[PDB]
Amino acid sequence: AVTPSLKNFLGSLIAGATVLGGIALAITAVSK
Amino acid sequence: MEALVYTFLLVGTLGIIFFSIFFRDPPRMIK
Amino acid sequence: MEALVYTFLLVGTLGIIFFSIFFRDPPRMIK
Amino acid sequence: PVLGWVLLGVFGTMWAIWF
Amino acid sequence: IFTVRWLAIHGIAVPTIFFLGAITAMQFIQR
Amino acid sequence: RPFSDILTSIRYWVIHSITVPALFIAGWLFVSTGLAYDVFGTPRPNEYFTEDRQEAPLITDRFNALEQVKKLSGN
Amino acid sequence: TIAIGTYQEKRTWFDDADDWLRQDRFVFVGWSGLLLFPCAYFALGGWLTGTTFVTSWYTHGLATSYLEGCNFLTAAVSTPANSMAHSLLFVWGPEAQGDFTRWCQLGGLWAFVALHGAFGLIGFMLRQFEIARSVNLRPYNAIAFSAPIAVFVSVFLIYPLGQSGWFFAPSFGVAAIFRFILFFQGFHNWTLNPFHMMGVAGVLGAALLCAIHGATVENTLFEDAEETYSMVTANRFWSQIFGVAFSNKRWLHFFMLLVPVTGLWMSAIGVVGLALNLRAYDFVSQEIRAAEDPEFETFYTKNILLNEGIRAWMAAQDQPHERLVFPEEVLPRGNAL
Amino acid sequence: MLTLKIFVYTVVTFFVCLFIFGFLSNDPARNPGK
Amino acid sequence: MLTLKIFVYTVVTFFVCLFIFGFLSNDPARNPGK
Amino acid sequence: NIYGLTATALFIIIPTSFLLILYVKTA
Amino acid sequence: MARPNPNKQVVELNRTSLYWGLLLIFVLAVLFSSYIFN
Amino acid sequence: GLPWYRVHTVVINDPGRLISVHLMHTALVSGWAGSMALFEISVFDPSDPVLNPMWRQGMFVLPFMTRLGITQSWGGWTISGETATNPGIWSYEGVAAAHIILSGALFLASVWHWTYWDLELFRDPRTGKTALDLPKIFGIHLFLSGLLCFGFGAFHVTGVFGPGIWVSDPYGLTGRVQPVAPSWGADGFDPYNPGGIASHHIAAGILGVLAGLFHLCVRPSIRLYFGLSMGSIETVLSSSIAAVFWAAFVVAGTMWYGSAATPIELFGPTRYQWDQGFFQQEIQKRVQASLAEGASLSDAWSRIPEKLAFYDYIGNNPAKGGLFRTGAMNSGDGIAVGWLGHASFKDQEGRELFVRRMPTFFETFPVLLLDKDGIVRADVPFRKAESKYSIEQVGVSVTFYGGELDGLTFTDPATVKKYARKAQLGEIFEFDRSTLQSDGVFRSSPRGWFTFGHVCFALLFFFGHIWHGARTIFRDVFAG
Amino acid sequence: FQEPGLVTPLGTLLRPLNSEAGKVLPGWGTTVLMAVFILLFAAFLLIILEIYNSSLILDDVSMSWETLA
Amino acid sequence: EPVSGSLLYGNNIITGAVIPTSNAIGLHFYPIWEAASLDEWLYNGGPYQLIVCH
Ligand code: CLA
Ligand code: CLA
Ligand code: CLA
Ligand code: CLA
Ligand SMILES: CCCCCCCCCCCCCCCC(=O)OC[C@H](COP(=O)(O)OC[C@@H](O)CO)OC(=O)CCCCCCCCCCCCCCC
Ligand SMILES: CCCCCCCCCCCCCCCC(=O)OC[C@H](COP(=O)(O)OC[C@@H](O)CO)OC(=O)CCCCCCCCCCCCCCC
Ligand SMILES: CCCCCCCCCCCCCCCC(=O)OC[C@H](COP(=O)(O)OC[C@@H](O)CO)OC(=O)CCCCCCCCCCCCCCC
Ligand SMILES: CC1=C(/C=C/C(C)=C/C=C/C(C)=C/C=C/C=C(C)/C=C/C=C(C)/C=C/C2=C(C)CCCC2(C)C)C(C)(C)CCC1
Ligand SMILES: CC1=C(/C=C/C(C)=C/C=C/C(C)=C/C=C/C=C(C)/C=C/C=C(C)/C=C/C2=C(C)CCCC2(C)C)C(C)(C)CCC1
Ligand SMILES: CC1=C(/C=C/C(C)=C/C=C/C(C)=C/C=C/C=C(C)/C=C/C=C(C)/C=C/C2=C(C)CCCC2(C)C)C(C)(C)CCC1
């Protein structure tokens, strides 16, 4: 089963990628 | 016997101090 | 405390022996 | 027998280095 | 102007003013 | 941009003059209205020792802690 | 195109990003800046927020904040309760479960500052590596910054990791550090440890070098490419005043690097031992003599008694999770000897 | 103490072998003149 | 021990005399140039 | 103190002699 | 092998290095002897 | 012209002699392993394996041999106190002897490679200059490593061909070497499950082979080759050091916190087991169940094995030693012989009393006798201090149930006071402090010493990674 | 300096392995594939750390000395 | 209640010391020639004042 802690951990994995994604696009936008 | 060991070590350190003050090494070039 | 004095005197004699052996005096002329 | 073993070890070591 | 210099200064100054206002009002809190 | 340019710039002063004091007051109201006491969970002076408990609190729990902190705190 | 080695190859978005990152401005972002700046900003932001608003009532039983009436010398960001063991205390973790108000209450803001701060120190070291490469210098400065990193890791991460929980790491405050300092003396006899002894020499020896070099260079100046002070006069002065003196500029300015860096590295090794309660607490030879001979007493024996006072009197409140209650008849007292 | 005995035997035999081989390595005495 | 006191007072006062008379023997600082 | 005494003795003889050998060979 | 190593060098330490080495060894012995004896 | 700290740099551009020095180091490590193993056998006392285990004897290397399935010795004694009918070739003495033989063999192979340094293997076919294909070499070595990782966990651990590993009862009562069935579900990731070790080495080994094959076939991209300075050999040293100290920390933490690879019956109890009363809770649970069966209180305590009661003792705690309290654990507080039995304290009017156990932090803890509720009733004044609740005034009495002194009772304040101090230390035992002239100050178990040794090396190797990494990236400026 | 070293029977067998030193692929090669694996490994290490740290509780696991039962 | 700090009285380098003068002396000047006897001078921590002053 999917314990409540697992759901949050997956959410954090998504959230961390979202934070990185914002920076990566930001560098390209300003660079270009 | 320990007091003997400590005293020798303290004197040994002082002996090295005496050597370094007086028996220095002449400077080399570039240095 | 006397053991310290005896040991120090013996070590001093040995140190003088070492100095005489190694830090020898270069010969002069005529001698 | 410690003597014999030690001597055999030291002699073999020296000879092996040479060979 | 919205260069990095603007962001860095406003990233520190803006919270600092808020906190300073928070602390100043926070002296008068009745005990 | 040089420091003198912004310092002497008229536009710099007018915008800052109307927003900086508002920001300061915003901090003043944040504590005055009591909002700070709630968001960060800091107890106000009176609700340090509740009726149920008259000593300093203590957690002694890890996975149930969140539920326990509800009881220790006066809410 | 960019010339990588002998051949030249068509540029890529990576090359475009690198040019902008290394672009010369007031603030050198560099590649490391992507990690140092966000982490260092939150390490500073977390401490300032924690001291101003967050309290320690529910973790330590103290009142550590400006809002509760504390100075700059008393406010602190206190460590979580002992019942948290070594939890990383994520805001989304199984403890807070995403509730910010009770995340701060549980003490999770200490882990926020420590973890983010720990990665800020990594970011700074990398930045020192990057700037040195950009300017083509030997990165001795980065190597000398390993000592503060080693101290931070040993004290704030390795030590509490070897204990029962985060509860026994230093808390980010002025007074709260003094509690930590006294805690080791009472419990760990940290002063008597050989490795602290070798760290005190480095720090005090380093300040000795800083004072003399500044004084010597500034007093041997020439009157007014070429050096501004007479190495000959300085060497002559100290060789006749003290007995020995430097004669090589490289060696002198490397000695000043070696004394402090080596000093803190040795002390860090000591704190690793304390992390396992692997203390250099006592001399067995002297303890036996004192026990059998009530009239025997040295300054070391007197120190041991003082440590007993620190432990018993402070343990009641410093460690609330043990619920210790010491009746007045069992607390150590001097007149009871 | 078997370890001490083994160490001492090893040192002694090493030195004795060094002695013997060193005296073997020398070349016979001869008179260059006459 | 009156004998010990007298010896020290003599050694102490002797050295102080050299110190005081030593600094008198120095001649005043002056700049040969300018 | 047999193990304590020997440890101190070796820590002195072994490094000091090693340093002296190198200095002699250098000069 | 007949061919010597082109990259063969000789260690060397001056008298100053000797004095630092001897002082470090003796000072460490002074500090740690009390604990080893215990 | 080489300073004393660069004397070993001569082999940087000499692959033939680089193999020699690496061979010599391997010979020294193997020589130590055999010598240390032989040393421990000459001192190990296999008489009592219950109250005098090997972790109580300061044995460092012996546990590691026994962890992978070596139990018998040529002396006719087994680690479990059996007869050792068929020691076989692979025994403690045999393995120690095997390492020394290998140590010597490597020594000879070191001399050969040192003398014959210039080989056509180390010469680039295109150009006569010496060279090393580091990207490809790493592929070969990784390929070999993957096979061993798969080989270990597929045959040695599972018991298909090898003996297996040491699995044990959660409470470290029954332990032995058994085959381990691999666990493939999420259940196989928890540290304390032996099935993880077999499952991991199978999966990691397979992936190691595939990656090893890949790095052989696919050459590095030109960008990475120059960005990572793959041409130099320093980069391999700096990166390798980084991996090593990462492994040291993980091994240090897994040893300190306990895991399936460091059984308590083999290395010693964990510190956190005393803090949380791991064994005390189990003993009480066992005793209460016996009481519910209708048995007497005296025989119920006698049902507790001495092995379990010997773990519930603060002396068997890795976090109680000292940095310079050298030697085996037995040298601290003697040899544990006999268990005196659970001690029960009662005041005059009837209420039973409990002694507050010493926290692991404190080195000198006051003696407190707490009532069931928790209120302090009896004390022991610091020394020559005015008392209001000392043993005499309240006149408490101590009764022993189970163990050596089951059924006895004491009331003399001197004797009760003596056993009160022993009560805060955990279970009460009788120690022989004359055989080894034990000092009386707790030492640390091999779990404590291993963790200290490897965390210190982990930090030191972090500086090495930085230094060698700095030289690689800044090679041109350092070189000239 | 120019004469080769020993022509060993073993050496001549191993030359193919140590023969193409310095060869590289144009452009970034497989670096994109590299990045995916690092992220997956970093994600993997977080899982075991959180499980072992008890900050991530699963239903199958127990994470205690009692699981040896 | 004397305190022993000599290296010959069961002290290490770490524990040894030159104990300061006695409390009974106070701030009074205490040379050798004012003590009743040498043992009295030693028993009152005389050598400390001699060392510190010099
Ligand atoms: C580079 C900057 C940086 C760094 C290094 C960190 C690092 C950290 N932060 Mg901080 N943080 C940052 C920026 C940063 N943060 C910013 C900008 C914010 C504002 C939003 C925060 C807000 C914040 C909070 C509020 C908290 C942290 C916490 C943490 C810690 C836990 C990390 C974790 O599990 O998150 C997640 C980490 C990862 C997911 C690692 C990345 C691994 C890869 C990318 C996963 C890829 C998988 C896959 C490809 C993606 C999914 C694919 C799918 C869509 C198909 C750690 C020390 C927590 C903590 O410990 O506090 C005590 C915490 O509570 N941070
Ligand atoms: C990390 C590796 C490691 C670990 C964990 C252990 C752990 C242990 N060993 Mg083993 N040992 C090791 C490596 C290791 N050893 C090596 C490499 C050797 C070869 C020399 C030995 C040789 C050895 C012997 C011969 C014996 C042990 C014993 C022991 C046990 C007693 C505790 C102890 O060592 O005293 C603690 C000692 C120290 C902590 C030493 C102090 C170190 C500090 C950091 C000072 C560092 C030096 C300093 C800078 C300069 C010194 C100055 C000088 C005056 C002394 C313990 C189980 C004893 C035992 O009971 O086994 C039956 C025993 O008899 N070991
Ligand atoms: C496997 C790891 C590894 C390897 C292969 C090397 C290899 C090298 N290092 Mg690095 N280094 C390492 C780890 C490693 N080091 C670590 C962990 C540190 C941190 C302490 C350093 C710090 C370091 C510095 C600061 C320098 C080097 C240098 C060098 C080069 C010359 C060796 C030397 O100093 O002369 C041989 C050294 C001696 C003869 C002195 C020996 C003194 C030791 C302390 C006493 C003996 C201790 C004991 C017997 C052995 C300990 C065993 C323990 C590891 C278990 C050589 C390429 C030097 C170099 O070339 O840079 C330009 C240099 O300056 N290294
Ligand atoms: C103080 C820390 C520190 C410093 C200053 C350096 C410095 C250096 N390293 Mg080393 N390294 C470190 C730690 C450090 N490293 C650690 C801990 C590891 C893992 C074992 C490595 C592994 C490593 C390898 C394998 C290599 C280097 C290399 C290098 C050099 C180039 C920089 C590089 O590769 O990127 C360094 C990159 C980082 C330190 C990562 C940045 C921080 C990450 C992205 C944040 C992730 C946070 C995430 C959310 C996790 C949260 C954790 C939370 C749950 C607790 C340089 C000398 C290279 C080299 O020498 O080439 C010549 C090389 O090949 N390093
Ligand atoms: C992508 C982030 C977008 C912005 C989010 C808001 C930012 C401001 C947060 C202020 C504090 C409030 C927190 C509430 C948080 C909250 O409410 O979460 C809610 C969410 C689910 O929680 P639940 O629904 O169980 O909570 C229920 C309760 O709210 C009521 O019962 O948690 C997650 O899924 C993960 C959240 C991550 C949030 C942090 C993101 C950053 C992680 C670090 C990334 C580092 C990457 C490093 C890579 C190198
Ligand atoms: C009237 C005043 C009398 C003062 C007497 C005291 C003099 C002290 C002389 C210290 C010599 C130390 C050895 C230097 C060895 C030596 O020959 O160094 C020589 C070095 C100069 O070296 P160079 O510049 O020639 O180096 C050239 C390079 O190529 C490297 O060789 O001098 C220094 O760096 C200053 C270091 C002072 C360090 C002071 C350490 C003090 C430690 C004292 C420990 C006492 C323990 C007592 C236990 C009881
Ligand atoms: C088991 C086999 C045996 C293992 C043990 C072997 C040990 C070998 C010897 C290792 C030590 C070598 C030390 C070299 C010593 C030496 O001569 O170094 C000299 C070196 C600088 O020399 P240069 O590179 O200028 O010299 C170039 C060439 O001429 C080579 O010297 O300085 C250093 O690198 C750091 C030295 C240690 C730090 C010295 C200062 C701090 C310690 C002294 C503190 C005194 C107390 C002050 C407070 C009271
Ligand atoms: C399978 C198996 C195994 C393993 C095994 C092994 C691993 C082995 C190895 C072995 C080895 C590892 C061997 C080696 C050897 C080497 C050698 C044998 C060397 C030689 C050399 C020489 C002889 C040299 C000589 C010389 C010199 C010295 C100098 C001059 C002259 C010459 C150069 C000639 C096990 C454990 C599982 C168990 C059993 C089965
Ligand atoms: C936690 C949090 C976060 C973040 C945060 C931050 C970012 C913060 C920041 C903060 C800040 C950024 C703050 C600041 C502050 C400041 C202050 C508080 C200041 C003060 C000052 C003072 C106090 C001064 C004084 C003085 C001077 C200098 C002048 C005159 C003299 C004197 C000395 C008086 C996150 C999102 C992650 C999550 C959620 C929550
Ligand atoms: C040749 C050969 C042989 C034999 C061999 C042998 C017998 C060997 C042995 C070997 C050995 C017998 C080796 C040993 C080694 C040892 C070592 C290698 C050690 C090391 C040590 C160390 C490294 C230490 C360190 C330390 C200390 C001192 C303590 C604490 C701190 C430290 C950790 C630093 C024969 C004839 C059979 C056959 C053929 C081959």
Coordinates of C-alpha atoms in Angstrom, one line a residue, chain L residues 338-471:
Chain L
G338 CA 27.8 -15.6 37.6
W339 CA 24.6 -13.5 37.7
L340 CA 23.4 -12.5 41.2
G341 CA 19.7 -12.2 40.1
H342 CA 17.2 -9.4 39.9
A343 CA 17.2 -7.1 43.0
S344 CA 13.9 -6.0 44.5
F345 CA 13.9 -3.1 47.0
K346 CA 11.1 -2.5 49.6
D347 CA 10.7 0.1 52.3
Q348 CA 9.5 -0.7 55.9
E349 CA 5.8 -0.1 55.2
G350 CA 5.7 -2.3 52.2
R351 CA 6.0 -0.3 49.0
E352 CA 8.6 -1.6 46.5
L353 CA 11.3 0.7 45.3
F354 CA 13.1 1.1 42.0
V355 CA 16.6 2.5 41.4
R356 CA 16.9 5.1 38.8
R357 CA 19.2 3.7 36.1
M358 CA 22.3 5.8 35.2
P359 CA 21.9 7.8 32.0
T360 CA 24.6 7.0 29.4
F361 CA 25.9 10.6 29.6
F362 CA 26.8 10.7 33.3
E363 CA 30.0 9.3 34.6
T364 CA 29.0 9.8 38.3
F365 CA 25.2 9.6 38.9
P366 CA 23.5 10.0 42.3
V367 CA 21.8 6.9 43.7
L368 CA 18.0 7.4 43.7
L369 CA 15.3 4.9 44.8
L370 CA 12.0 5.9 43.3
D371 CA 8.5 4.8 44.3
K372 CA 6.2 3.2 41.8
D373 CA 4.6 6.7 41.2
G374 CA 8.0 8.3 40.7
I375 CA 8.5 10.3 43.9
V376 CA 12.0 9.8 45.4
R377 CA 11.8 7.9 48.7
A378 CA 15.3 6.7 49.6
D379 CA 18.6 8.3 48.7
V380 CA 22.4 8.0 49.3
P381 CA 23.8 11.3 50.5
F382 CA 26.7 12.7 48.5
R383 CA 29.2 12.0 51.2
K384 CA 29.3 12.9 54.9
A385 CA 26.2 15.1 54.2
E386 CA 23.2 15.6 56.4
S387 CA 20.5 13.2 55.4
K388 CA 16.7 13.1 55.7
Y389 CA 15.9 10.0 53.5
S390 CA 19.1 7.9 53.6
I391 CA 18.8 4.1 53.7
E392 CA 19.0 3.9 57.5
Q393 CA 16.2 6.4 58.2
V394 CA 13.8 4.7 55.8
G395 CA 15.4 1.3 56.4
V396 CA 14.8 -0.2 53.0
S397 CA 15.5 -3.9 52.3
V398 CA 16.7 -5.7 49.2
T399 CA 15.5 -9.2 48.1
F400 CA 17.1 -11.2 45.3
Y401 CA 14.9 -13.3 43.0
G402 CA 16.4 -15.7 40.5
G403 CA 20.0 -16.0 39.6
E404 CA 22.8 -17.0 42.0
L405 CA 21.2 -15.5 45.2
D406 CA 17.6 -16.3 44.6
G407 CA 15.5 -16.2 47.7
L408 CA 18.0 -14.4 49.9
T409 CA 17.1 -11.2 51.7
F410 CA 19.2 -8.5 53.3
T411 CA 18.5 -5.7 55.7
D412 CA 21.9 -4.4 56.9
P413 CA 22.2 -0.8 55.7
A414 CA 25.8 -1.4 54.7
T415 CA 24.9 -4.3 52.5
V416 CA 21.7 -2.7 51.1
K417 CA 23.6 0.5 50.3
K418 CA 26.3 -1.6 48.5
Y419 CA 23.7 -3.3 46.3
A420 CA 21.8 0.0 45.6
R421 CA 24.9 1.4 43.8
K422 CA 25.1 -1.7 41.7
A423 CA 21.4 -1.5 40.9
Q424 CA 21.6 1.8 39.0
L425 CA 24.3 0.1 36.7
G426 CA 21.7 -2.3 35.3
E427 CA 21.6 -6.0 36.3
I428 CA 23.8 -7.0 39.1
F429 CA 26.8 -9.3 38.4
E430 CA 29.8 -10.8 40.1
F431 CA 33.1 -9.8 38.5
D432 CA 36.6 -11.4 38.9
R433 CA 38.9 -8.3 39.0
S434 CA 42.0 -10.2 40.2
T435 CA 42.8 -12.3 37.2
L436 CA 43.6 -9.2 35.1
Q437 CA 44.1 -6.7 37.9
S438 CA 41.1 -4.8 36.4
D439 CA 41.1 -1.1 37.2
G440 CA 37.3 -0.7 37.6
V441 CA 36.7 1.9 34.9
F442 CA 34.5 1.0 31.9
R443 CA 36.3 0.4 28.6
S444 CA 34.7 0.5 25.1
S445 CA 33.7 -2.4 22.9
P446 CA 35.0 -3.1 19.4
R447 CA 31.8 -1.3 18.1
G448 CA 33.0 1.9 19.8
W449 CA 36.6 1.6 18.6
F450 CA 35.7 0.7 15.0
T451 CA 33.4 3.7 14.8
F452 CA 36.0 6.1 16.2
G453 CA 38.7 4.9 14.0
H454 CA 36.8 5.1 10.7
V455 CA 35.1 8.5 11.3
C456 CA 38.5 10.0 12.0
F457 CA 39.8 8.6 8.8
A458 CA 36.7 9.8 6.9
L459 CA 37.4 13.4 7.9
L460 CA 41.1 13.2 7.2
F461 CA 40.4 11.7 3.8
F462 CA 38.0 14.6 3.1
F463 CA 41.0 16.9 3.2
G464 CA 42.9 14.6 1.0
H465 CA 40.1 14.6 -1.6
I466 CA 40.2 18.5 -1.6
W467 CA 43.9 18.7 -1.9
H468 CA 44.3 16.2 -4.7
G469 CA 41.2 17.6 -6.4
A470 CA 42.7 21.1 -6.2
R471 CA 46.0 20.0 -7.8

